[PDB]
Amino acid sequence: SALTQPPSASGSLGQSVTISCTGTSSDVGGYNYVSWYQQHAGKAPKVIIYEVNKRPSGVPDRFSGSKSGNTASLTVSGLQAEDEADYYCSSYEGSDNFVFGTGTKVTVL
Ligand SMILES: O=C(O)c1cc(/N=N/c2ccc(S(=O)(=O)Nc3ccccn3)cc2)ccc1O
């Protein structure tokens, strides 16, 4: 029981990176309650997106979410050096329960 994410992804500075988060019709595909977290090495996780494509305050406009079917995604557009980090998704999966993805390490070329 984990959501599927690519282990790693790279992009050039100023370009975009997209990270997918694939589950099933019982979680990612069944609800609009996908969240994304950014974690720099040895630091606490930052909430970047909730409810598929809502941003907390302080998250730049260049981070966005989308979802189609059983796959949600996070795009980091206008890639900056500080965007190098591990990124995790999560979903609601029914009955007051949540499930996390396995994480993607994003590097800048
Ligand atoms: O500042 C904020 O906006 C802020 C927002 C935060 N959002 N946290 C989350 C984390 C996950 C979700 S979610 O995509 O799972 N959505 C939901 C929605 C309703 C019930 C359960 N889950 C929803 C909100 C958490 C802390 C904060 O400070």
mmCIF file of C-alpha atoms and ligand atoms in Angstrom:
data_model
loop_
_atom_site.group_PDB
_atom_site.id
_atom_site.type_symbol
_atom_site.label_atom_id
_atom_site.label_comp_id
_atom_site.label_asym_id
_atom_site.label_seq_id
_atom_site.Cartn_x
_atom_site.Cartn_y
_atom_site.Cartn_z
ATOM 1 C CA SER A 1 0.000 0.000 0.000
ATOM 2 C CA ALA A 2 1.974 3.075 -1.393
ATOM 3 C CA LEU A 3 1.099 5.477 -4.229
ATOM 4 C CA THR A 4 3.527 5.159 -7.214
ATOM 5 C CA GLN A 5 5.931 7.971 -8.030
ATOM 6 C CA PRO A 6 9.041 7.992 -10.244
ATOM 7 C CA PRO A 7 12.138 7.607 -8.032
ATOM 8 C CA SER A 8 13.808 10.603 -9.603
ATOM 9 C CA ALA A 9 13.254 13.383 -12.095
ATOM 10 C CA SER A 10 15.485 16.174 -13.494
ATOM 11 C CA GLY A 11 15.004 19.466 -15.282
ATOM 12 C CA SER A 12 17.004 22.369 -16.436
ATOM 13 C CA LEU A 13 16.930 25.715 -14.671
ATOM 14 C CA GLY A 14 13.922 27.763 -15.789
ATOM 15 C CA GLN A 15 12.213 24.737 -17.323
ATOM 16 C CA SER A 16 9.582 22.489 -15.735
ATOM 17 C CA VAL A 17 9.513 19.149 -13.945
ATOM 18 C CA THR A 18 6.383 17.096 -13.633
ATOM 19 C CA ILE A 19 6.044 14.400 -10.952
ATOM 20 C CA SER A 20 3.206 11.825 -11.177
ATOM 21 C CA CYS A 21 1.399 10.121 -8.283
ATOM 22 C CA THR A 22 -0.579 7.020 -9.339
ATOM 23 C CA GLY A 23 -3.056 5.228 -7.211
ATOM 24 C CA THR A 24 -6.419 3.522 -7.751
ATOM 25 C CA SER A 25 -10.023 4.415 -8.150
ATOM 26 C CA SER A 26 -10.291 3.993 -4.311
ATOM 27 C CA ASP A 27 -7.856 6.768 -3.495
ATOM 28 C CA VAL A 28 -6.273 9.176 -6.037
ATOM 29 C CA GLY A 29 -9.044 8.556 -8.551
ATOM 30 C CA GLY A 30 -11.881 8.512 -6.050
ATOM 31 C CA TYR A 31 -11.384 11.875 -4.272
ATOM 32 C CA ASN A 32 -9.935 15.397 -4.823
ATOM 33 C CA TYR A 33 -7.752 15.095 -1.685
ATOM 34 C CA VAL A 34 -4.232 14.783 -3.070
ATOM 35 C CA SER A 35 -1.464 16.661 -1.210
ATOM 36 C CA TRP A 36 2.161 17.294 -2.072
ATOM 37 C CA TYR A 37 5.107 17.786 0.277
ATOM 38 C CA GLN A 38 8.615 19.113 -0.386
ATOM 39 C CA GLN A 39 11.451 17.882 1.842
ATOM 40 C CA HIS A 40 15.048 19.218 1.661
ATOM 41 C CA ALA A 41 17.667 16.873 2.954
ATOM 42 C CA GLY A 42 17.491 16.762 6.792
ATOM 43 C CA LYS A 43 14.721 19.312 7.048
ATOM 44 C CA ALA A 44 11.081 19.047 7.931
ATOM 45 C CA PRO A 45 8.490 18.633 5.078
ATOM 46 C CA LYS A 46 6.740 21.659 3.603
ATOM 47 C CA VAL A 47 3.131 21.500 2.497
ATOM 48 C CA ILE A 48 3.122 22.649 -1.143
ATOM 49 C CA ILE A 49 -0.325 21.587 -2.455
ATOM 50 C CA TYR A 50 -3.517 20.238 -0.939
ATOM 51 C CA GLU A 51 -6.852 19.206 -2.531
ATOM 52 C CA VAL A 52 -5.067 18.508 -5.819
ATOM 53 C CA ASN A 53 -4.228 22.143 -6.684
ATOM 54 C CA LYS A 54 -4.641 24.430 -3.732
ATOM 55 C CA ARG A 55 -1.617 26.220 -2.329
ATOM 56 C CA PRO A 56 -0.889 27.293 1.171
ATOM 57 C CA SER A 57 0.350 30.801 1.571
ATOM 58 C CA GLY A 58 3.983 31.184 0.687
ATOM 59 C CA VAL A 59 4.040 28.632 -2.104
ATOM 60 C CA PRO A 60 4.964 30.297 -5.449
ATOM 61 C CA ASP A 61 2.695 30.356 -8.462
ATOM 62 C CA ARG A 62 5.102 28.142 -10.292
ATOM 63 C CA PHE A 63 3.964 25.073 -8.342
ATOM 64 C CA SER A 64 0.715 23.599 -9.615
ATOM 65 C CA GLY A 65 -1.272 20.412 -9.510
ATOM 66 C CA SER A 66 -3.438 18.479 -11.902
ATOM 67 C CA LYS A 67 -5.300 15.161 -11.876
ATOM 68 C CA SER A 68 -6.775 12.867 -14.460
ATOM 69 C CA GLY A 69 -8.055 9.400 -13.735
ATOM 70 C CA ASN A 70 -5.977 7.610 -11.153
ATOM 71 C CA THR A 71 -2.922 9.845 -11.583
ATOM 72 C CA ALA A 72 -2.285 13.156 -9.943
ATOM 73 C CA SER A 73 0.678 15.296 -10.712
ATOM 74 C CA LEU A 74 2.761 18.140 -9.421
ATOM 75 C CA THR A 75 4.514 20.505 -11.871
ATOM 76 C CA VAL A 76 7.331 22.747 -10.716
ATOM 77 C CA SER A 77 7.634 25.308 -13.455
ATOM 78 C CA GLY A 78 10.439 27.838 -13.758
ATOM 79 C CA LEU A 79 12.748 25.408 -11.988
ATOM 80 C CA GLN A 80 15.138 26.991 -9.473
ATOM 81 C CA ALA A 81 18.095 25.566 -7.564
ATOM 82 C CA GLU A 82 16.117 25.634 -4.317
ATOM 83 C CA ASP A 83 13.536 23.307 -5.864
ATOM 84 C CA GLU A 84 16.000 20.371 -5.609
ATOM 85 C CA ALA A 85 14.386 18.196 -2.915
ATOM 86 C CA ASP A 86 12.392 15.064 -2.356
ATOM 87 C CA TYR A 87 8.683 15.345 -3.147
ATOM 88 C CA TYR A 88 5.911 13.166 -1.764
ATOM 89 C CA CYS A 89 2.222 12.896 -2.571
ATOM 90 C CA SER A 90 -0.564 11.636 -0.401
ATOM 91 C CA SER A 91 -4.222 10.837 -0.878
ATOM 92 C CA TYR A 92 -7.350 10.177 1.126
ATOM 93 C CA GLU A 93 -8.283 6.465 0.704
ATOM 94 C CA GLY A 94 -11.646 6.361 2.462
ATOM 95 C CA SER A 95 -12.623 5.687 6.154
ATOM 96 C CA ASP A 96 -10.528 8.563 7.708
ATOM 97 C CA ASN A 97 -7.343 6.998 6.216
ATOM 98 C CA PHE A 98 -4.482 8.377 4.018
ATOM 99 C CA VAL A 99 -1.825 6.830 1.865
ATOM 100 C CA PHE A 100 1.554 8.250 0.794
ATOM 101 C CA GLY A 101 3.665 7.948 -2.276
ATOM 102 C CA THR A 102 7.158 6.581 -2.350
ATOM 103 C CA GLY A 103 8.794 9.888 -3.169
ATOM 104 C CA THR A 104 10.633 11.540 -6.073
ATOM 105 C CA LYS A 105 14.050 13.130 -5.858
ATOM 106 C CA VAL A 106 14.156 16.204 -8.119
ATOM 107 C CA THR A 107 17.531 17.422 -9.397
ATOM 108 C CA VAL A 108 18.450 20.388 -11.495
ATOM 109 C CA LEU A 109 20.598 19.674 -14.597
HETATM 110 O O1 LIG B 1 -1.372 27.285 5.747
HETATM 111 C C1 LIG B 1 -2.079 26.413 5.186
HETATM 112 O O2 LIG B 1 -2.885 26.718 4.269
HETATM 113 C C2 LIG B 1 -1.949 24.981 5.588
HETATM 114 C C3 LIG B 1 -2.563 23.970 4.907
HETATM 115 C C4 LIG B 1 -2.415 22.699 5.232
HETATM 116 N N1 LIG B 1 -3.050 21.723 4.476
HETATM 117 N N2 LIG B 1 -2.919 20.551 4.928
HETATM 118 C C5 LIG B 1 -3.582 19.598 4.222
HETATM 119 C C6 LIG B 1 -3.043 18.405 3.974
HETATM 120 C C7 LIG B 1 -3.841 17.480 3.225
HETATM 121 C C8 LIG B 1 -5.163 17.762 2.717
HETATM 122 S S1 LIG B 1 -6.007 16.790 1.674
HETATM 123 O O3 LIG B 1 -5.547 17.010 0.163
HETATM 124 O O4 LIG B 1 -5.809 15.465 2.193
HETATM 125 N N3 LIG B 1 -7.546 17.246 1.810
HETATM 126 C C9 LIG B 1 -8.424 16.863 2.764
HETATM 127 C C10 LIG B 1 -9.568 17.644 2.833
HETATM 128 C C11 LIG B 1 -10.543 17.413 3.802
HETATM 129 C C12 LIG B 1 -10.356 16.358 4.656
HETATM 130 C C13 LIG B 1 -9.205 15.604 4.566
HETATM 131 N N4 LIG B 1 -8.236 15.843 3.635
HETATM 132 C C14 LIG B 1 -5.676 18.998 3.047
HETATM 133 C C15 LIG B 1 -4.883 19.902 3.801
HETATM 134 C C16 LIG B 1 -1.715 22.331 6.333
HETATM 135 C C17 LIG B 1 -1.139 23.354 7.114
HETATM 136 C C18 LIG B 1 -1.229 24.687 6.799
HETATM 137 O O5 LIG B 1 -0.649 25.735 7.458
#
